[model samples]
Target chain A: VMNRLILAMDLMNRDDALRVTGEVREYIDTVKIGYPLVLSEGMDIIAEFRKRFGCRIIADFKVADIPETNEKICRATFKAGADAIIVHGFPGADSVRACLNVAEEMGREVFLLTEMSHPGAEMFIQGAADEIARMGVDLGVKNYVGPSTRPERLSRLREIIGQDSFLISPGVGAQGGDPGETLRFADAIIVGRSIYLADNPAAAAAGIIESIKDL
Target chain B: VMNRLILAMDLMNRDDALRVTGEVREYIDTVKIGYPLVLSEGMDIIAEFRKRFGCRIIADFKVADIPETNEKICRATFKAGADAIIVHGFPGADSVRACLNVAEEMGREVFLLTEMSHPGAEMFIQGAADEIARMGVDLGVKNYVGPSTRPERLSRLREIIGQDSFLISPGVGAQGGDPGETLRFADAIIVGRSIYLADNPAAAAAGIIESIKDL
Candidate 1:
């Protein structure tokens, strides 16, 4: 399998996203069009890009809500062609479990946001990781999306969630986290502006992908 | 018009949901299915509820992912028959703008979680209230949601979001907020389990409706 490198379009507009998608198509397998781009082009933008790139789409929705709404949203996204979607563990089991059901019904996968990379990330993640781990497993969720920048935390999370579930790591490039080292524990690595807005976008993407290619 | 009262269901088994839905139908116009039930039952439950109640549904899926993901997930939710959906303002202008775009195409309305009832609600609302007011006038978005059980806060929000957009007031029951007072500034009321688990749910719901009947 080609080791996957994800391009996170954190704040790129439609024109920029389209251009980046074209440039990085050779090196990247996925483009994580996050809150910024989605806000600019809307949902149709995803379909538009998918038509061009024909890559797997992951809607890191980091979602939380009431169960019925959450599941329906998941199914709707699945129908719209999301390969995987995110739901947060912060909102409690009711929401997480709802997302799990949606994933099952849509035949898509679910990734739980176990930790964030920002300054206050620990306040919630530190206090809540264990609870989320027990509940996420009880709910049968298998994928975790968290920071790989912290090796000790990544190892602990790997232990907590077990090896069966894949960990999608972020915080490389601009965030100054090392893709090479982080990938030792990550199932797949996601890089954003660091790749897309680099001196050479394609090369930047390839360098990161090359790091995990052996895995 | 029947006041919109949502029966917030937690993560429940199939049998329990069926039983609770039966109990809830007696009082509310819309059964606000949350993330938990969705985890358990999937979209089939929403379809079932639609078949049974013919109620207006709100997918409280606080969609907060990246752009592409938000689009895909939202379109999925809308297709699954959600009348309204939510996206947060935390991710800044771009994310909210994208969610609104999805809503526009899907023939759905987007509710913004502007003034959260959470403790930190004040930080943004108080800090950025003026900027929001100026932006609202510029953008012409009148409907804004805030958690204001108190007259002072609601009045402040009215100063910011203005009078054109509707206010969907939450935190009026179990969170120690009062509906009678909230109704003064609210365009609509979203009362959840407060009615569902009451000794006499129908009466309790009726009491809320009766309180706001004049307005």
Candidate 2:
């Protein structure tokens, strides 16, 4: 179970990122650590977050590589203490399966990124999001990522994956998506700049939680 | 401008990878370093390879992410001394454009992975590879990646991108791709396991290069 709010810790500085996440720790139980922090810092940061916050770490690496390389990436990621790693489905089932295999072996989970949450996602990802979701289901995947920027697409992805499958979404803030509306389809809304960039990280998260209170 | 052969340095061990790369450095002037080694060792390894052999380091991260995060990944990658970065085109044009903008600003090159080269690429990547190439061209991309495993698709990708664009390929040696046939379309053929896994990496690279000399 999550807090229905996942902070997308996209900042590059380690001390400030940790401080912000710690500030808002009460409102968000899960943290998305992407390449920005990981590349700037190191994989050790994942473990640091885990040890400090006791929160679920989703290494949103958006793993897109050949199957062989995918396996190695997954191995390194899982070893670094990520509870689940986000992988791209566009690379094909085999590439995804590579991550899944490693996740299975390491007692980790693979969250298939069915669609991205950005303007450019409309270019090609929009056309193939559904098929990618279907492929994830066919491959026995249980977790997925969809764009909260478009509620309709998020709903369709939810429909494709079914109720039992878990789906997290991004684009809740800064990208113009309503938190309550996004929560209707997404298990958790990924918020980045709005919270991390806010003067008070805790207050920003509280405001988001307050907006989507009844939902 | 290349040796028609690029080393896919996929090994996780820094010492071994460096030794093998050095062994084959004479035969190959370009090295494709992926997450396996980078994650295991560090990004500083890119600088190390450049200083040791002066090889054109291609960070084949297969970057697939939202535009905001993609921008950060590109910046960190270019800062690591990578001459070129390979990115996934399936996430849509905007995400690819994020990398493009950074590359332009940093004076680095972005190699759009039009289609992945693996057994599973047939699932989704192959379907969109053509349109992806068209998008890349529309975005004014000058370099690309195609599957060496399939000469026909590689040729078609070449046709779509036109002869002016640089196209590199993977799947050459261990993936059942013919070096000469792959070279017919790909400006450089990527060889990994076949060379790096061999007891004599220098000899393996030499054999691959020698085999494609006449063409």
Candidate 3:
């Protein structure tokens, strides 16, 4: 029941981002509009992705600014047609509260960045993962961004945040995260290069979906 | 002789953003196009502000992402005509390095987020300010975003980063930061609502500039 794959549109070019999303649209539950795609194409890309796939667009800006800024970015992202937006916990309570308020008013979602997938993430987030997760939970954040590369950490976060919160993990495939092991704890796994880089992205996405379907 | 004030056009409305920038451009050294303005107006706003002010634009996105994504965001921001971009240090070395690489290739600038002016910033960045500041230095960063509200912290950062590196301090006027005291260590002060919210922003900015000119 927790089996879902979110395609990460991390490509630099707009065409490539659209092409990959079109290829894997059927197999994926949501499309993550990461920094590159959003920066390259602007907020209009969210509507394009939504129209093409009729799927949820997760604006993964990992925003960290003041409360006023947090509100505006969330308002703009939702206005541009994103179903949800991701924010960093580093900006703290007032900022998170502002974003949460925007999401509540707009009927959108907000995902907290508890931990990242990159190798360098451990240095910055590992120690604060528990604290961050707890703060997000207390702040009524229902979704979290955790690392799929570290299944143990993912499990720990799942345990800390409890079953009610949804867990979305990145770092599968190209980042060396095992889809089988990572998906055991994640509600949805975010895969990037492994699916997008394939000669036939549709087939790659289908195979990945099939492989993780029942696991 | 260090009399630089970076006007932060952090408004969500396009007309207000342009109006405020147009009013204060002659008094400020650079204009910070924050997330709200960029999201609401799109990348073209960069060109519009640049054309109107004939000043440098700092893309205050506070970008946090993977290496490739970081590079692309930097590339896109610079391509959109931003002279410099702000990046979060929470993503660690690889992400910062990737952004720095793009900044170097494009002959642009990268400003690292050392600390923030918000109260919540103390919970996250104040503790790691030393580490983040040193890391930015080691990564060859010349510009850092430090808090204007914390004179002691700003002094510490000024000392840590040395004389050659430029420090940009926000949180002046409306944010309760003393321009005279904060500018003692800051190379440039970023002021937002104080000027933007005033009935006569030009006179407000002029008054503030005059007040801090001798400090």
Q: TM-score: which candidate is best?
A: 2
lDDT of 1 by residue, A1-215 (tens): 13656777655368877887788888767766653455334556667777888887787657754454566567756665668887777556776777887777668888888766543355334456666666678778888877766766777778888888878877777766887777777777788868777878888877777666655
Q: For this target, which candidate reaches the highest lDDT against the unseen true structure?
A: 2
Candidate 1 at B17: error in angstroms? 26
TM-scores, all candidates, are 0.58, 0.97, 0.97
| Decoy 3 TM-score against native | 0.97
DockQ of candidate 1 compared with the true complex: 0.08
State the lDDT of candidate 1 residue by residue for B45-125, as single tens digits: 666777777777776656655444566657766766777776654444545566778888988877665555544244223
- What is the TM-score ranking, best to worst? 2, 3, 1
Pairs of residues at least 3 apart in sequence or in different chains that clash in candidate 3: none
lDDT of 3 by residue, A1-215 (tens): 21388888888788888888887777876888876777667888889888978888899978789888788889999999999999988778888899999999999999998888887786666777788888898999999989988999999999989988898989999888988898789888888889888999999888888888657
Native-to-model Cα distance after best TM-score fit, residue B142 in candidate 1, in Å: 18
Cα distance off (Å), candidate 1, residue B37: 20
Per-residue lDDT value at A175 in model 2: 89
Separate DockQ for every predicted complex: 0.08, 0.80, 0.73
Comparing 1 and 2 by DockQ, which wins? 2
